Design a binder for this molecule. Sequence first.
Ligand code: NA
Length: 129
Amino acid sequence: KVFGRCELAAAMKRHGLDNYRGYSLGNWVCAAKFESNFNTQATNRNTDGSTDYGILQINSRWWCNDGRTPGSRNLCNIPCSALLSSDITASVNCAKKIVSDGNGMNAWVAWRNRCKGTDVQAWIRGCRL
Ligand code: NA
């Protein structure tokens, strides 16, 4: 599923991501924009052989099981395929664990490079929330 900007902001808010670990909703929408272009089916293979999955490009090295990332963990206790669902519940629940891990949203290199310190409120401007 390719979400609309305000459609994804509403889904993230409903699942309690708005101001989670102090990150305003526009931070999460900005991260999803540059990670996946709001596409739940987005995948990216990393040089290390891990894979990033879903709207927030969650990586198989730590967070999900894909059966093909040697030495990896599955700290969200999910198959990585769950991160490609039209239902963002698995992505949101796993993102909460990631952002709680110590480095906040710096875990998402695209958030650090393209969202951090920008006017992230523009990502929810005009959304009925
Ligand atoms: Na894994």
